[PDB]
């Protein structure tokens, strides 16, 4: 490309396998937040949470697109493998899958951080450092504490409900 | 009539039959709200619940007569059988008569829909689309939702008053 | 009743007598409004009337069952009756069975207040004389009014289309 | 066409003899309202009406060619006929005319569908449904309206003057 | 007095008595509010409802000395007995013993309308009807209302506290 400069091919693939985490995740919420939407599961404060995580992920990869486009290099696409469950238990199991998941992106945006790192490519690392890292940390932390306040709660179904109404 | 046109003798006969189904189910959710204002009751969120669904199918009657007339037909009014209860036990109970109700008024509707299409009535078919098929499925779904809610809640007086405050 | 006091079980029973009245009467309002929406009947204004007077009517019984419950009287209803018409014919021959309907509804009222003053019930005689007599007699009073309007106006077609057109 | 899916030859030629059909109306409602604006005859409120159904006819032409075009169908226009009629009588004689006529493309619409239907072609049907199937069934209850309450005013000239003062 | 007309000593007498019922209740509101406002009861909406009641109470009295005035009778106070307990319990405690107090206020309200029926005083009869007898029904009723869901939440504690923050 044109425009190109400082740019490795090791980051270039990397960012475009970071896409499609972004999306799978972002698949992963979907399902999570229809799954709250069940007639026999009617949780709609959590189905809310997940579907606007959901959203949140999908905007994580249409950002690290423009960036990868921004650099000169180039965007591919794979299949997008479906999500790890088709039903997700409760609000428990669902908070702890997505803690999973969020720390599971975590580590591939630490470990293109320490790429980046590797290649000298500080544009890389200060896009990181504003878009991502940070607001990794602090969703991790938000569904700790919900999942502090979760297993206090657990009269299971009781707290279940309480735990929809008065915190999601 | 001048204006008849398309509209068969079955249908008209259905319609009147349908209006008489949505003042009866009126009637119930009247019977319904009163019960869960006694003082030995006293759930004012359900009889809240209640006596709108009964202003609702009230106003489907309405909708039908309208329709009736709209199309050519004769409004013949029936007696209103009583409600099938006259105390309704537990928000629980009453949510699952509730849901019995909707299903059947469901049932009717798609019976006259189906009437529509074998008697090739257009106009009659758009009018139940329009105007109550996904009104039927948006408020079996809510009443599912809130079954699964409170059959969760179930210390099942806790539970009751939980519910009542928190969703209704 | 934990809060039932000085309500009578003759009271009681006259409360539920007259919750059915009312809604018969509504029952008999939406037929004679439905009637003058008919295509060869076709007096609006004749249909808006009695259509108000159907929510009046409603309104009426639902203001009783309130009543019922306040004093720990129990609501019972019972099988609502078809109206005693199927066609209504002219504006006069309905206004004159619309009179009659509120004469017979104006005696239940005042049968229950010679009741209520039997049995030594103030509160009943004050709610009857501050939500029912007073409506009644006013109510009464217009459609004698309208009556002596209508017979004046008896070249029939001619006058019941001034009517429809310049009162109601 | 490239955009051509579903549409068969037989309802693209049946959307345009409806045009034609619609246009055709329009034409008549055009002649109906300035007959009623002859110095000789002079009824504001008929003219106006019947101009005003003028304006809705073309409109309803002007949809359906749209809607040929979205399809990928292709318009085709034929000569217009004039209307049956150079003086169209009395209002009543008039309003009898426009209520055949409405019928007319009542039946129109009602074989269209019912070839869409045969046809497979849900669009064409939802269509018909969405614009003009509840549309006609309106305006032939007030059309039915109207000619109950001129025949009720039939001293046949005061009658008349009095039709279009207080309902036109 | 000038003004004295139809005023029997009978109800003067007894006017004075409701008087010394009505600022009794009020003080016994008032022990019962500051009860609840203890560090070791410390349920602040418990403490309000009952706060507001001694307002309401003292304010009826006020009304039926303004009416002996009005109508010539002459105040005449005497001693007010502290209430009935120094500590009250738990919320259902005080509730129950609230509902016992306005019975008896409402019984002597009764018993001084049968007086005035007696006595022939219209006046009598019509102050009580239009400022206290609906007041004392719907307040009973509200009562009833709060002592069955108190008595459904009844796990005490987590009961008590529900109450006072989802409902006081």
Redo the contacts between chains.
Sequence with gaps: SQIRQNYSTEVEAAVNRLVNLYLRASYTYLSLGFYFDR????L?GVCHFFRELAEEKREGAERLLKMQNQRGGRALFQDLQKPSQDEWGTTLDAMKAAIVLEKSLNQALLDLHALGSAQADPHLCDFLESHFLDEEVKLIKKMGDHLTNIQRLV?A??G???FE??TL
């Design positions: 007639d026999d599961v009617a709609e009269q179904g009781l279940e409900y309480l109404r008065l």
